[PDB]
PDB file of all heavy atoms in Angstrom:
ATOM      1  N   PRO E1104      -4.317  -3.296 -18.478  1.00 36.49           N
ATOM      2  CA  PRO E1104      -3.904  -4.680 -18.100  1.00 36.49           C
ATOM      3  C   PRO E1104      -2.533  -4.611 -17.506  1.00 36.49           C
ATOM      4  O   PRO E1104      -1.588  -4.013 -18.104  1.00 36.49           O
ATOM      5  CB  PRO E1104      -3.865  -5.407 -19.416  1.00 36.49           C
ATOM      6  CG  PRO E1104      -3.582  -4.344 -20.502  1.00 36.49           C
ATOM      7  CD  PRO E1104      -4.205  -3.053 -19.915  1.00 36.49           C
ATOM      8  N   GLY E1105      -2.343  -5.242 -16.355  1.00 35.86           N
ATOM      9  CA  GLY E1105      -1.032  -5.247 -15.715  1.00 35.86           C
ATOM     10  C   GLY E1105      -0.789  -6.444 -14.831  1.00 35.86           C
ATOM     11  O   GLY E1105      -1.192  -7.598 -15.156  1.00 35.86           O
ATOM     12  N   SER E1106      -0.085  -6.209 -13.694  1.00 36.16           N
ATOM     13  CA  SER E1106       0.475  -7.281 -12.881  1.00 36.16           C
ATOM     14  C   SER E1106       0.313  -7.069 -11.415  1.00 36.16           C
ATOM     15  O   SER E1106      -0.026  -5.917 -10.980  1.00 36.16           O
ATOM     16  CB  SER E1106       1.977  -7.462 -13.196  1.00 36.16           C
ATOM     17  OG  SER E1106       2.746  -6.381 -12.621  1.00 36.16           O
ATOM     18  N   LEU E1107       0.610  -8.060 -10.609  1.00 36.89           N
ATOM     19  CA  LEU E1107       0.873  -7.839  -9.211  1.00 36.89           C
ATOM     20  C   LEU E1107       2.062  -6.856  -9.121  1.00 36.89           C
ATOM     21  O   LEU E1107       3.030  -6.902  -9.913  1.00 36.89           O
ATOM     22  CB  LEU E1107       1.265  -9.107  -8.494  1.00 36.89           C
ATOM     23  CG  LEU E1107       0.232 -10.241  -8.618  1.00 36.89           C
ATOM     24  CD1 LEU E1107       0.815 -11.443  -7.870  1.00 36.89           C
ATOM     25  CD2 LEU E1107      -1.038  -9.742  -7.935  1.00 36.89           C
ATOM     26  N   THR E1108       2.071  -6.025  -8.086  1.00 34.90           N
ATOM     27  CA  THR E1108       3.228  -5.085  -7.880  1.00 34.90           C
ATOM     28  C   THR E1108       4.224  -5.577  -6.847  1.00 34.90           C
ATOM     29  O   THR E1108       5.192  -4.906  -6.581  1.00 34.90           O
ATOM     30  CB  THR E1108       2.728  -3.713  -7.444  1.00 34.90           C
ATOM     31  OG1 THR E1108       2.244  -3.755  -6.136  1.00 34.90           O
ATOM     32  CG2 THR E1108       1.735  -3.137  -8.459  1.00 34.90           C
ATOM     33  N   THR E1109       4.011  -6.803  -6.357  1.00 34.29           N
ATOM     34  CA  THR E1109       4.955  -7.487  -5.476  1.00 34.29           C
ATOM     35  C   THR E1109       5.258  -8.866  -6.138  1.00 34.29           C
ATOM     36  O   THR E1109       4.413  -9.406  -6.852  1.00 34.29           O
ATOM     37  CB  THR E1109       4.373  -7.742  -4.091  1.00 34.29           C
ATOM     38  OG1 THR E1109       3.078  -8.364  -4.195  1.00 34.29           O
ATOM     39  CG2 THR E1109       4.224  -6.455  -3.308  1.00 34.29           C
ATOM     40  N   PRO E1110       6.443  -9.443  -5.827  1.00 33.07           N
ATOM     41  CA  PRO E1110       6.656 -10.846  -6.182  1.00 33.07           C
ATOM     42  C   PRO E1110       5.406 -11.678  -5.775  1.00 33.07           C
ATOM     43  O   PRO E1110       4.866 -11.448  -4.646  1.00 33.07           O
ATOM     44  CB  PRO E1110       7.896 -11.220  -5.319  1.00 33.07           C
ATOM     45  CG  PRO E1110       8.653  -9.904  -5.322  1.00 33.07           C
ATOM     46  CD  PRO E1110       7.576  -8.825  -5.079  1.00 33.07           C
ATOM     47  N   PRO E1111       4.922 -12.567  -6.635  1.00 33.13           N
ATOM     48  CA  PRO E1111       5.641 -13.073  -7.823  1.00 33.13           C
ATOM     49  C   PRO E1111       5.446 -12.296  -9.104  1.00 33.13           C
ATOM     50  O   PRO E1111       5.944 -12.716 -10.170  1.00 33.13           O
ATOM     51  CB  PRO E1111       5.074 -14.493  -7.977  1.00 33.13           C
ATOM     52  CG  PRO E1111       3.637 -14.327  -7.433  1.00 33.13           C
ATOM     53  CD  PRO E1111       3.793 -13.414  -6.261  1.00 33.13           C
ATOM     54  N   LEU E1112       4.807 -11.118  -9.050  1.00 32.67           N
ATOM     55  CA  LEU E1112       4.682 -10.188 -10.204  1.00 32.67           C
ATOM     56  C   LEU E1112       3.899 -10.699 -11.380  1.00 32.67           C
ATOM     57  O   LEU E1112       3.962 -10.249 -12.501  1.00 32.67           O
ATOM     58  CB  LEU E1112       6.055  -9.673 -10.671  1.00 32.67           C
ATOM     59  CG  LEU E1112       6.857  -9.005  -9.519  1.00 32.67           C
ATOM     60  CD1 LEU E1112       8.296  -8.786 -10.016  1.00 32.67           C
ATOM     61  CD2 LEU E1112       6.285  -7.630  -9.158  1.00 32.67           C
ATOM     62  N   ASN E1113       3.046 -11.716 -11.090  1.00 35.00           N
ATOM     63  CA  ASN E1113       2.229 -12.363 -12.181  1.00 35.00           C
ATOM     64  C   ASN E1113       1.470 -11.348 -12.958  1.00 35.00           C
ATOM     65  O   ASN E1113       0.823 -10.407 -12.382  1.00 35.00           O
ATOM     66  CB  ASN E1113       1.234 -13.394 -11.588  1.00 35.00           C
ATOM     67  CG  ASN E1113       1.884 -14.533 -10.878  1.00 35.00           C
ATOM     68  OD1 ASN E1113       3.082 -14.612 -10.718  1.00 35.00           O
ATOM     69  ND2 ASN E1113       1.108 -15.499 -10.496  1.00 35.00           N
ATOM     70  N   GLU E1114       1.351 -11.540 -14.262  1.00 36.86           N
ATOM     71  CA  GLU E1114       0.599 -10.655 -15.156  1.00 36.86           C
ATOM     72  C   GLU E1114      -0.823 -11.065 -15.254  1.00 36.86           C
ATOM     73  O   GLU E1114      -1.326 -11.476 -16.324  1.00 36.86           O
ATOM     74  CB  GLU E1114       1.348 -10.578 -16.531  1.00 36.86           C
ATOM     75  CG  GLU E1114       2.707  -9.899 -16.324  1.00 36.86           C
ATOM     76  CD  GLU E1114       3.533  -9.669 -17.600  1.00 36.86           C
ATOM     77  OE1 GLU E1114       3.352 -10.465 -18.549  1.00 36.86           O
ATOM     78  OE2 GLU E1114       4.377  -8.702 -17.571  1.00 36.86           O
ATOM     79  N   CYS E1115      -1.534 -10.895 -14.125  1.00 36.39           N
ATOM     80  CA  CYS E1115      -2.877 -11.449 -14.015  1.00 36.39           C
ATOM     81  C   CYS E1115      -3.887 -10.442 -13.610  1.00 36.39           C
ATOM     82  O   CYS E1115      -5.017 -10.804 -13.203  1.00 36.39           O
ATOM     83  CB  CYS E1115      -2.860 -12.550 -12.932  1.00 36.39           C
ATOM     84  SG  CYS E1115      -2.322 -11.981 -11.270  1.00 36.39           S
ATOM     85  N   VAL E1116      -3.536  -9.119 -13.650  1.00 34.89           N
ATOM     86  CA  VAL E1116      -4.430  -8.081 -13.027  1.00 34.89           C
ATOM     87  C   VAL E1116      -5.066  -7.171 -14.097  1.00 34.89           C
ATOM     88  O   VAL E1116      -4.349  -6.606 -14.941  1.00 34.89           O
ATOM     89  CB  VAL E1116      -3.653  -7.228 -12.053  1.00 34.89           C
ATOM     90  CG1 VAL E1116      -4.547  -6.150 -11.432  1.00 34.89           C
ATOM     91  CG2 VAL E1116      -2.994  -8.090 -10.968  1.00 34.89           C
ATOM     92  N   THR E1117      -6.367  -7.017 -13.985  1.00 36.99           N
ATOM     93  CA  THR E1117      -6.984  -5.848 -14.574  1.00 36.99           C
ATOM     94  C   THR E1117      -6.993  -4.750 -13.545  1.00 36.99           C
ATOM     95  O   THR E1117      -7.606  -4.895 -12.485  1.00 36.99           O
ATOM     96  CB  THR E1117      -8.472  -6.130 -15.009  1.00 36.99           C
ATOM     97  OG1 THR E1117      -8.420  -7.189 -15.990  1.00 36.99           O
ATOM     98  CG2 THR E1117      -9.060  -4.859 -15.659  1.00 36.99           C
ATOM     99  N   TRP E1118      -6.219  -3.651 -13.792  1.00 36.36           N
ATOM    100  CA  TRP E1118      -6.136  -2.528 -12.845  1.00 36.36           C
ATOM    101  C   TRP E1118      -7.285  -1.556 -13.096  1.00 36.36           C
ATOM    102  O   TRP E1118      -7.570  -1.216 -14.262  1.00 36.36           O
ATOM    103  CB  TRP E1118      -4.780  -1.817 -12.994  1.00 36.36           C
ATOM    104  CG  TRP E1118      -3.734  -2.518 -12.211  1.00 36.36           C
ATOM    105  CD1 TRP E1118      -2.834  -3.519 -12.622  1.00 36.36           C
ATOM    106  CD2 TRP E1118      -3.532  -2.443 -10.801  1.00 36.36           C
ATOM    107  NE1 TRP E1118      -2.116  -3.934 -11.626  1.00 36.36           N
ATOM    108  CE2 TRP E1118      -2.524  -3.330 -10.431  1.00 36.36           C
ATOM    109  CE3 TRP E1118      -4.126  -1.682  -9.807  1.00 36.36           C
ATOM    110  CZ2 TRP E1118      -2.071  -3.484  -9.150  1.00 36.36           C
ATOM    111  CZ3 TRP E1118      -3.681  -1.798  -8.512  1.00 36.36           C
ATOM    112  CH2 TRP E1118      -2.653  -2.672  -8.155  1.00 36.36           C
ATOM    113  N   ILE E1119      -7.910  -1.149 -11.974  1.00 38.06           N
ATOM    114  CA  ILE E1119      -8.961  -0.131 -12.074  1.00 38.06           C
ATOM    115  C   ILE E1119      -8.540   0.907 -10.994  1.00 38.06           C
ATOM    116  O   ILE E1119      -8.596   0.624  -9.835  1.00 38.06           O
ATOM    117  CB  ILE E1119     -10.347  -0.735 -11.718  1.00 38.06           C
ATOM    118  CG1 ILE E1119     -10.672  -1.883 -12.701  1.00 38.06           C
ATOM    119  CG2 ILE E1119     -11.411   0.348 -11.771  1.00 38.06           C
ATOM    120  CD1 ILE E1119     -11.867  -2.710 -12.401  1.00 38.06           C
ATOM    121  N   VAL E1120      -8.125   2.066 -11.491  1.00 36.38           N
ATOM    122  CA  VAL E1120      -7.553   3.094 -10.557  1.00 36.38           C
ATOM    123  C   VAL E1120      -8.486   4.296 -10.525  1.00 36.38           C
ATOM    124  O   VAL E1120      -8.778   4.856 -11.580  1.00 36.38           O
ATOM    125  CB  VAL E1120      -6.134   3.517 -11.048  1.00 36.38           C
ATOM    126  CG1 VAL E1120      -5.571   4.632 -10.086  1.00 36.38           C
ATOM    127  CG2 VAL E1120      -5.182   2.307 -10.983  1.00 36.38           C
ATOM    128  N   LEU E1121      -9.038   4.568  -9.367  1.00 36.32           N
ATOM    129  CA  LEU E1121     -10.009   5.680  -9.256  1.00 36.32           C
ATOM    130  C   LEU E1121      -9.334   7.045  -9.443  1.00 36.32           C
ATOM    131  O   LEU E1121      -8.268   7.269  -8.902  1.00 36.32           O
ATOM    132  CB  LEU E1121     -10.754   5.652  -7.913  1.00 36.32           C
ATOM    133  CG  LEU E1121     -11.612   4.365  -7.704  1.00 36.32           C
ATOM    134  CD1 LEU E1121     -12.511   4.546  -6.499  1.00 36.32           C
ATOM    135  CD2 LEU E1121     -12.481   4.031  -8.884  1.00 36.32           C
ATOM    136  N   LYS E1122     -10.029   7.954 -10.174  1.00 39.04           N
ATOM    137  CA  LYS E1122      -9.471   9.304 -10.358  1.00 39.04           C
ATOM    138  C   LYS E1122      -9.481  10.093  -9.098  1.00 39.04           C
ATOM    139  O   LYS E1122      -8.599  10.916  -8.848  1.00 39.04           O
ATOM    140  CB  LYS E1122     -10.335   9.995 -11.422  1.00 39.04           C
ATOM    141  CG  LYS E1122     -10.209  11.530 -11.578  1.00 39.04           C
ATOM    142  CD  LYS E1122     -11.415  11.966 -12.465  1.00 39.04           C
ATOM    143  CE  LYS E1122     -12.678  12.502 -11.729  1.00 39.04           C
ATOM    144  NZ  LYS E1122     -13.383  11.752 -10.638  1.00 39.04           N
ATOM    145  N   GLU E1123     -10.471   9.954  -8.231  1.00 36.05           N
ATOM    146  CA  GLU E1123     -10.636  10.816  -7.055  1.00 36.05           C
ATOM    147  C   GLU E1123      -9.853  10.192  -5.887  1.00 36.05           C
ATOM    148  O   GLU E1123     -10.203   9.096  -5.486  1.00 36.05           O
ATOM    149  CB  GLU E1123     -12.059  10.963  -6.690  1.00 36.05           C
ATOM    150  CG  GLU E1123     -12.361  11.941  -5.559  1.00 36.05           C
ATOM    151  CD  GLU E1123     -13.859  11.961  -5.187  1.00 36.05           C
ATOM    152  OE1 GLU E1123     -14.728  11.740  -6.041  1.00 36.05           O
ATOM    153  OE2 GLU E1123     -14.188  12.206  -4.000  1.00 36.05           O
ATOM    154  N   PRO E1124      -8.910  10.938  -5.294  1.00 33.14           N
ATOM    155  CA  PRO E1124      -8.291  10.472  -4.056  1.00 33.14           C
ATOM    156  C   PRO E1124      -9.193  10.517  -2.876  1.00 33.14           C
ATOM    157  O   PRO E1124     -10.138  11.306  -2.841  1.00 33.14           O
ATOM    158  CB  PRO E1124      -7.075  11.464  -3.838  1.00 33.14           C
ATOM    159  CG  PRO E1124      -7.564  12.719  -4.462  1.00 33.14           C
ATOM    160  CD  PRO E1124      -8.435  12.320  -5.643  1.00 33.14           C
ATOM    161  N   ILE E1125      -8.857   9.726  -1.859  1.00 33.38           N
ATOM    162  CA  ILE E1125      -9.421  10.041  -0.510  1.00 33.38           C
ATOM    163  C   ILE E1125      -8.394  10.881   0.213  1.00 33.38           C
ATOM    164  O   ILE E1125      -7.223  10.768  -0.009  1.00 33.38           O
ATOM    165  CB  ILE E1125      -9.871   8.748   0.229  1.00 33.38           C
ATOM    166  CG1 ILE E1125      -8.654   7.837   0.487  1.00 33.38           C
ATOM    167  CG2 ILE E1125     -10.981   8.012  -0.543  1.00 33.38           C
ATOM    168  CD1 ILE E1125      -8.954   6.727   1.493  1.00 33.38           C
ATOM    169  N   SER E1126      -8.904  11.652   1.185  1.00 32.12           N
ATOM    170  CA  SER E1126      -8.032  12.364   2.134  1.00 32.12           C
ATOM    171  C   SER E1126      -7.955  11.570   3.387  1.00 32.12           C
ATOM    172  O   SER E1126      -9.034  11.092   3.872  1.00 32.12           O
ATOM    173  CB  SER E1126      -8.540  13.785   2.469  1.00 32.12           C
ATOM    174  OG  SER E1126      -8.581  14.576   1.329  1.00 32.12           O
ATOM    175  N   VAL E1127      -6.791  11.438   3.916  1.00 34.14           N
ATOM    176  CA  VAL E1127      -6.515  10.937   5.204  1.00 34.14           C
ATOM    177  C   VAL E1127      -5.754  11.959   6.024  1.00 34.14           C
ATOM    178  O   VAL E1127      -5.010  12.820   5.452  1.00 34.14           O
ATOM    179  CB  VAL E1127      -5.768   9.600   5.141  1.00 34.14           C
ATOM    180  CG1 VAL E1127      -6.561   8.594   4.298  1.00 34.14           C
ATOM    181  CG2 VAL E1127      -4.365   9.743   4.516  1.00 34.14           C
ATOM    182  N   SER E1128      -5.721  11.875   7.319  1.00 30.54           N
ATOM    183  CA  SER E1128      -4.990  12.929   8.085  1.00 30.54           C
ATOM    184  C   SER E1128      -3.540  12.513   8.276  1.00 30.54           C
ATOM    185  O   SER E1128      -3.177  11.301   8.201  1.00 30.54           O
ATOM    186  CB  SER E1128      -5.631  13.155   9.477  1.00 30.54           C
ATOM    187  OG  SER E1128      -5.562  11.972  10.238  1.00 30.54           O
ATOM    188  N   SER E1129      -2.735  13.481   8.619  1.00 29.41           N
ATOM    189  CA  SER E1129      -1.325  13.285   8.961  1.00 29.41           C
ATOM    190  C   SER E1129      -1.262  12.256  10.097  1.00 29.41           C
ATOM    191  O   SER E1129      -0.402  11.371  10.037  1.00 29.41           O
ATOM    192  CB  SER E1129      -0.663  14.606   9.419  1.00 29.41           C
ATOM    193  OG  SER E1129      -1.341  15.238  10.490  1.00 29.41           O
ATOM    194  N   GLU E1130      -2.130  12.324  11.113  1.00 31.39           N
ATOM    195  CA  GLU E1130      -2.058  11.375  12.207  1.00 31.39           C
ATOM    196  C   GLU E1130      -2.348   9.921  11.764  1.00 31.39           C
ATOM    197  O   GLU E1130      -1.779   8.999  12.292  1.00 31.39           O
ATOM    198  CB  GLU E1130      -3.081  11.695  13.338  1.00 31.39           C
ATOM    199  CG  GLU E1130      -2.694  13.014  14.058  1.00 31.39           C
ATOM    200  CD  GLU E1130      -3.438  14.222  13.491  1.00 31.39           C
ATOM    201  OE1 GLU E1130      -3.966  14.213  12.360  1.00 31.39           O
ATOM    202  OE2 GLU E1130      -3.423  15.291  14.192  1.00 31.39           O
ATOM    203  N   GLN E1131      -3.266   9.777  10.819  1.00 33.39           N
ATOM    204  CA  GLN E1131      -3.550   8.428  10.304  1.00 33.39           C
ATOM    205  C   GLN E1131      -2.352   7.845   9.579  1.00 33.39           C
ATOM    206  O   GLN E1131      -1.948   6.687   9.851  1.00 33.39           O
ATOM    207  CB  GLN E1131      -4.779   8.531   9.374  1.00 33.39           C
ATOM    208  CG  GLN E1131      -6.051   8.756  10.189  1.00 33.39           C
ATOM    209  CD  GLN E1131      -7.307   8.820   9.395  1.00 33.39           C
ATOM    210  OE1 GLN E1131      -7.373   9.442   8.291  1.00 33.39           O
ATOM    211  NE2 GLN E1131      -8.408   8.220   9.885  1.00 33.39           N
ATOM    212  N   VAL E1132      -1.699   8.612   8.680  1.00 32.34           N
ATOM    213  CA  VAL E1132      -0.621   8.078   7.963  1.00 32.34           C
ATOM    214  C   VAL E1132       0.639   7.898   8.886  1.00 32.34           C
ATOM    215  O   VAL E1132       1.421   6.930   8.654  1.00 32.34           O
ATOM    216  CB  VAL E1132      -0.298   8.935   6.720  1.00 32.34           C
ATOM    217  CG1 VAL E1132      -1.378   9.203   5.742  1.00 32.34           C
ATOM    218  CG2 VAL E1132       0.305  10.218   7.066  1.00 32.34           C
ATOM    219  N   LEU E1133       0.774   8.688   9.930  1.00 33.26           N
ATOM    220  CA  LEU E1133       1.855   8.500  10.883  1.00 33.26           C
ATOM    221  C   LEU E1133       1.761   7.123  11.537  1.00 33.26           C
ATOM    222  O   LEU E1133       2.807   6.482  11.823  1.00 33.26           O
ATOM    223  CB  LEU E1133       1.928   9.672  11.879  1.00 33.26           C
ATOM    224  CG  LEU E1133       2.658  10.931  11.332  1.00 33.26           C
ATOM    225  CD1 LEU E1133       2.313  11.957  12.392  1.00 33.26           C
ATOM    226  CD2 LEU E1133       4.170  10.795  11.143  1.00 33.26           C
ATOM    227  N   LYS E1134       0.506   6.648  11.731  1.00 34.87           N
ATOM    228  CA  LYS E1134       0.407   5.290  12.362  1.00 34.87           C
ATOM    229  C   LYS E1134       0.824   4.183  11.399  1.00 34.87           C
ATOM    230  O   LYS E1134       1.387   3.208  11.859  1.00 34.87           O
ATOM    231  CB  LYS E1134      -1.033   5.047  12.919  1.00 34.87           C
ATOM    232  CG  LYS E1134      -1.279   5.887  14.169  1.00 34.87           C
ATOM    233  CD  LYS E1134      -2.769   5.844  14.530  1.00 34.87           C
ATOM    234  CE  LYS E1134      -2.950   6.027  16.004  1.00 34.87           C
ATOM    235  NZ  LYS E1134      -2.796   7.426  16.447  1.00 34.87           N
ATOM    236  N   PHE E1135       0.594   4.353  10.107  1.00 33.39           N
ATOM    237  CA  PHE E1135       1.100   3.399   9.150  1.00 33.39           C
ATOM    238  C   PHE E1135       2.659   3.303   9.294  1.00 33.39           C
ATOM    239  O   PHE E1135       3.271   2.208   9.256  1.00 33.39           O
ATOM    240  CB  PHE E1135       0.860   3.828   7.696  1.00 33.39           C
ATOM    241  CG  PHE E1135      -0.553   3.646   7.165  1.00 33.39           C
ATOM    242  CD1 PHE E1135      -1.650   3.395   7.961  1.00 33.39           C
ATOM    243  CD2 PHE E1135      -0.743   3.755   5.789  1.00 33.39           C
ATOM    244  CE1 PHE E1135      -2.912   3.253   7.399  1.00 33.39           C
ATOM    245  CE2 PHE E1135      -1.991   3.667   5.220  1.00 33.39           C
ATOM    246  CZ  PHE E1135      -3.085   3.396   6.007  1.00 33.39           C
ATOM    247  N   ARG E1136       3.329   4.481   9.453  1.00 31.80           N
ATOM    248  CA  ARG E1136       4.766   4.550   9.476  1.00 31.80           C
ATOM    249  C   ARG E1136       5.389   4.006  10.766  1.00 31.80           C
ATOM    250  O   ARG E1136       6.647   4.021  10.862  1.00 31.80           O
ATOM    251  CB  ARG E1136       5.204   6.043   9.230  1.00 31.80           C
ATOM    252  CG  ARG E1136       4.765   6.548   7.920  1.00 31.80           C
ATOM    253  CD  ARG E1136       5.422   7.918   7.679  1.00 31.80           C
ATOM    254  NE  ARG E1136       4.928   8.498   6.412  1.00 31.80           N
ATOM    255  CZ  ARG E1136       4.414   9.716   6.296  1.00 31.80           C
ATOM    256  NH1 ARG E1136       4.389  10.620   7.290  1.00 31.80           N
ATOM    257  NH2 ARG E1136       3.986  10.117   5.051  1.00 31.80           N
ATOM    258  N   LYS E1137       4.618   3.708  11.776  1.00 31.01           N
ATOM    259  CA  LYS E1137       5.063   3.079  13.019  1.00 31.01           C
ATOM    260  C   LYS E1137       5.219   1.591  12.917  1.00 31.01           C
ATOM    261  O   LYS E1137       5.852   0.935  13.770  1.00 31.01           O
ATOM    262  CB  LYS E1137       4.194   3.462  14.223  1.00 31.01           C
ATOM    263  CG  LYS E1137       4.276   4.931  14.599  1.00 31.01           C
ATOM    264  CD  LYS E1137       3.470   5.124  15.904  1.00 31.01           C
ATOM    265  CE  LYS E1137       3.439   6.587  16.346  1.00 31.01           C
ATOM    266  NZ  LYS E1137       2.477   7.455  15.587  1.00 31.01           N
ATOM    267  N   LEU E1138       4.639   0.964  11.857  1.00 31.09           N
ATOM    268  CA  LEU E1138       4.760  -0.437  11.634  1.00 31.09           C
ATOM    269  C   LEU E1138       6.220  -0.744  11.296  1.00 31.09           C
ATOM    270  O   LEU E1138       7.026   0.168  10.950  1.00 31.09           O
ATOM    271  CB  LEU E1138       3.904  -0.897  10.445  1.00 31.09           C
ATOM    272  CG  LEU E1138       2.399  -0.814  10.736  1.00 31.09           C
ATOM    273  CD1 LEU E1138       1.640  -0.962   9.436  1.00 31.09           C
ATOM    274  CD2 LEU E1138       2.002  -1.869  11.743  1.00 31.09           C
ATOM    275  N   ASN E1139       6.595  -1.998  11.458  1.00 30.31           N
ATOM    276  CA  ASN E1139       8.026  -2.440  11.255  1.00 30.31           C
ATOM    277  C   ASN E1139       8.053  -3.543  10.219  1.00 30.31           C
ATOM    278  O   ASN E1139       7.139  -4.423  10.111  1.00 30.31           O
ATOM    279  CB  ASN E1139       8.537  -3.141  12.512  1.00 30.31           C
ATOM    280  CG  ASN E1139       9.021  -2.195  13.606  1.00 30.31           C
ATOM    281  OD1 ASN E1139       9.567  -2.682  14.574  1.00 30.31           O
ATOM    282  ND2 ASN E1139       8.750  -0.932  13.544  1.00 30.31           N
ATOM    283  N   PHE E1140       9.037  -3.468   9.295  1.00 33.37           N
ATOM    284  CA  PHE E1140       9.275  -4.567   8.348  1.00 33.37           C
ATOM    285  C   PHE E1140       9.752  -5.817   9.056  1.00 33.37           C
ATOM    286  O   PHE E1140       9.509  -6.923   8.606  1.00 33.37           O
ATOM    287  CB  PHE E1140      10.372  -4.187   7.317  1.00 33.37           C
ATOM    288  CG  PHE E1140       9.983  -3.215   6.232  1.00 33.37           C
ATOM    289  CD1 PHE E1140      10.733  -2.057   6.002  1.00 33.37           C
ATOM    290  CD2 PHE E1140       8.904  -3.427   5.329  1.00 33.37           C
ATOM    291  CE1 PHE E1140      10.442  -1.159   4.946  1.00 33.37           C
ATOM    292  CE2 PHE E1140       8.667  -2.571   4.236  1.00 33.37           C
ATOM    293  CZ  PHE E1140       9.427  -1.425   4.061  1.00 33.37           C
ATOM    294  N   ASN E1141      10.556  -5.604  10.080  1.00 32.13           N
ATOM    295  CA  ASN E1141      11.259  -6.687  10.732  1.00 32.13           C
ATOM    296  C   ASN E1141      10.349  -7.439  11.675  1.00 32.13           C
ATOM    297  O   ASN E1141       9.310  -6.941  12.154  1.00 32.13           O
ATOM    298  CB  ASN E1141      12.436  -6.093  11.569  1.00 32.13           C
ATOM    299  CG  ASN E1141      11.946  -5.012  12.494  1.00 32.13           C
ATOM    300  OD1 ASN E1141      11.647  -3.884  12.087  1.00 32.13           O
ATOM    301  ND2 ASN E1141      11.801  -5.413  13.753  1.00 32.13           N
ATOM    302  N   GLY E1142      10.767  -8.675  11.936  1.00 33.45           N
ATOM    303  CA  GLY E1142      10.224  -9.468  12.980  1.00 33.45           C
ATOM    304  C   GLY E1142      10.759  -8.958  14.372  1.00 33.45           C
ATOM    305  O   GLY E1142      11.794  -8.269  14.474  1.00 33.45           O
ATOM    306  N   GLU E1143       9.911  -9.198  15.408  1.00 32.53           N
ATOM    307  CA  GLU E1143      10.334  -8.841  16.775  1.00 32.53           C
ATOM    308  C   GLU E1143      11.670  -9.461  17.096  1.00 32.53           C
ATOM    309  O   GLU E1143      11.831 -10.678  16.922  1.00 32.53           O
ATOM    310  CB  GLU E1143       9.253  -9.320  17.761  1.00 32.53           C
ATOM    311  CG  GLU E1143       9.860  -9.483  19.161  1.00 32.53           C
ATOM    312  CD  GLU E1143       9.076  -8.891  20.353  1.00 32.53           C
ATOM    313  OE1 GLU E1143       7.935  -8.370  20.144  1.00 32.53           O
ATOM    314  OE2 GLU E1143       9.644  -8.910  21.529  1.00 32.53           O
ATOM    315  N   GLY E1144      12.652  -8.666  17.516  1.00 32.55           N
ATOM    316  CA  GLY E1144      13.992  -9.180  17.835  1.00 32.55           C
ATOM    317  C   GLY E1144      15.049  -9.187  16.751  1.00 32.55           C
ATOM    318  O   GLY E1144      16.078  -9.880  16.950  1.00 32.55           O
ATOM    319  N   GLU E1145      14.805  -8.453  15.625  1.00 32.09           N
ATOM    320  CA  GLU E1145      15.689  -8.127  14.547  1.00 32.09           C
ATOM    321  C   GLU E1145      15.797  -6.694  14.663  1.00 32.09           C
ATOM    322  O   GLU E1145      14.871  -6.056  15.206  1.00 32.09           O
ATOM    323  CB  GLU E1145      15.032  -8.501  13.202  1.00 32.09           C
ATOM    324  CG  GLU E1145      14.603  -9.977  13.130  1.00 32.09           C
ATOM    325  CD  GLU E1145      13.647 -10.284  11.898  1.00 32.09           C
ATOM    326  OE1 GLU E1145      13.405  -9.473  10.947  1.00 32.09           O
ATOM    327  OE2 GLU E1145      13.118 -11.408  11.961  1.00 32.09           O
TER     328      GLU E1145
END
């Protein structure tokens, strides 16, 4: 039993975490890292 991991952090989650990972490639995760936190023009 746990919570959201972002605000508002409510304690409302039953967590189910799989034991087996998936594999993704270096190229796939590099595209995640090209995203920006900021809005366009910050």
Side-chain angles (χ1 to χ4, degrees):
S1106 73
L1107 304 179
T1108 70
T1109 51
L1112 304 168
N1113 298 5
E1114 294 182 334
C1115 59
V1116 179
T1117 300
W1118 278 93
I1119 300 170
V1120 177
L1121 296 192
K1122 164 194 97 306
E1123 184 183 330
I1125 62 166
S1126 298
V1127 304
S1128 63
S1129 56
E1130 295 93 343
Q1131 288 180 320
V1132 305
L1133 279 168
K1134 289 169 151 77
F1135 284 14
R1136 299 188 184 128
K1137 295 185 182 78
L1138 290 167
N1139 279 186
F1140 286 126
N1141 54 283
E1143 156 132 6
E1145 303 168 11

